[PDB]
Design a protein around this ligand. Structure first.
Ligand SMILES: Cc1cc(F)c(NC(=O)c2cccc(C(C)(C)C#N)c2)cc1-c1cnc2c(=O)n(C)ncc2c1
Ligand SMILES: Cc1cc(F)c(NC(=O)c2cccc(C(C)(C)C#N)c2)cc1-c1cnc2c(=O)n(C)ncc2c1
Lengths: 258, 250
């Protein structure tokens, strides 16, 4: 039983607010993050999200701690101190060492490898959803508040660059692998893909039809050969030609030691 | 949480005791695997340990990840890189800054406070069982495979169960004494049976004059309340945690 009774969680500072939820910093036997989401759609979506998080016990996956029903639906997770991968590469524009870049990728592949072993498809893997908690441990969660956390979907502008061709035209282990390849492109170039394109509808049409893919010539000079090859396999147009996370993780782990 | 046979790559042996061997390993990253024909007593003890760990989802508590039955009973937790609090204070005589000492105590009280909210009595809280994982996050587990941390009632062989929230609080007070003095209690006593006889009869308790000069007044008072002979006079972990949290901000 993970239900936290009414009056234990001290809800504090509002961290973020979206169209389908408000996240708050809080106290409950230490620091926590509380997601406040009642209609039957919200009730099914709350229980689906608690059911998926309930299945995760991994260091590289955001620690679910509990949930509440009264006086409002709430999901309690650990507090993540620091910034997302998107904030480090694109806002702080920090230049991590190659060792630190390969370690973030290794930690992300461990979390994704664990998720796919537990039959969990992320569906929204992106640098925004990869937290560099305490600047050392990588925490994969779903910190987005603009979409509903349901089994399947029927305003996705902050996720288009990580969508595979079949996801634009769907959700599988291979579509997460594509998104991870995009994350690898961000680590290896320091930039988001398709920066020269001026419209979102041009990326949607060109990526979807297979005539558009990240430019691997824009990668850092010190980027390893195995990393260039790994990104290329994860970003393949045909999803069946994409590697699985065990093979991705073992390539990053063999690269990290070399 | 059952992990099928052939997923965990069991590697380096980390420790071996009378009833368990811990190994470093791989399973979607780094793991610690505790290995135990299996006896019905040991089958009950394995399921009891998996049942308690199953109830814990806290940053300051060792992350249980899974368990296996074949080809032998195994409990899979996260890997803890670094050293225990006992190793930092007594083996390597690391002299942490007072801010770092209060932070370890704060993290330990958060984990213990969480455990007592989930109706879980540790029963073996000691510096050995407090891991300074990545030298920043405190992980409370049970890495044993303890007399100095036993409360007077626990030390006495009574007809009743002496283990309670208050006996964990006493053990925590001992842990506070170790953080504030850098030493284990009762170093002048020459025999274990003398500590067993004197602590039990209430005539023996740690010497709070041996604490560091820079030790805060609220910390001296907190240790004293946690180390009281009468267990009902000991504070609860919410009050302990709020006193350490108030002290940390000062
Ligand atoms: C409170 C909360 C409650 C939740 F329920 C989720 N939800 C998931 O993480 C989630 C949902 C669906 C599928 C998945 C899977 C398992 C596939 C993954 N990965 C994961 C996230 C948060 C959350 C939001 N924001 C923050 C934040 O801003 N900080 C700084 N720190 C922590 C923090 C935590
Ligand atoms: C593998 C393993 C399996 C287990 F089952 C337990 N058992 C508990 O943690 C346990 C049991 C009973 C009650 C409790 C409570 C909840 C009271 C607490 N706390 C906790 C511990 C470990 C373990 C051993 N050694 C190591 C180690 O050496 N390194 C370096 N890193 C990790 C590591 C992990």
């Amino acid at each position: 039983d993970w239900e936290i009774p009414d009056g234990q969680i001290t809800v504090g500072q509002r961290i973020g607010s979206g169209s389908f939820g408000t996240v708050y910093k809080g106290k409950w036997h230490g620091d926590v993050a509380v997601k406040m989401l009642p209609t039957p759609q919200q009730l099914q979506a709350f229980k689906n999200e608690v059911g998926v998080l309930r299945k995760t016990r991994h260091v590289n996956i955001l620690l679910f701690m509990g949930y509440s029903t009264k006086p409002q639906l709430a999901i309690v997770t650990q507090w993540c101190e620091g910034s997302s991968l998107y904030k480090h590469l694109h806002a702080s524009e920090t230049k991590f060492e190659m060792k630190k870049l390969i370690d973030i990728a290794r930690q992300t592949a461990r979390g994704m490898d664990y998720l796919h072993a537990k039959s969990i498809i992320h569906r929204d893997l992106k640098s925004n959803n990869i937290f560099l908690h305490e600047d050392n441990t990588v925490k994969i969660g779903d910190f987005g508040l603009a979409t509903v956390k349901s089994r399947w979907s029927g305003q996705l502008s902050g996720s288009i660059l990580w969508m595979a061709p079949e996801v634009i035209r769907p959700y599988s282990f291979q579509s997460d692998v594509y998104a991870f390849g995009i994350v690898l492109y961000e680590l290896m170039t320091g930039q988001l893909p398709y920066s020269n394109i001026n419209n979102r509808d041009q990326i949607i049409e060109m990526v979807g039809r297979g005539s558009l893919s990240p430019d691997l010539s824009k990668v850092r000079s010190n980027c390893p050969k195995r990393m260039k090859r790994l990104m290329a396999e994860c970003l393949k147009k045909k999803r069946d030609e994409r590697p699985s996370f065990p093979r991705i993780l073992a390539e990053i782990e063999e690269l990290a030691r070399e």
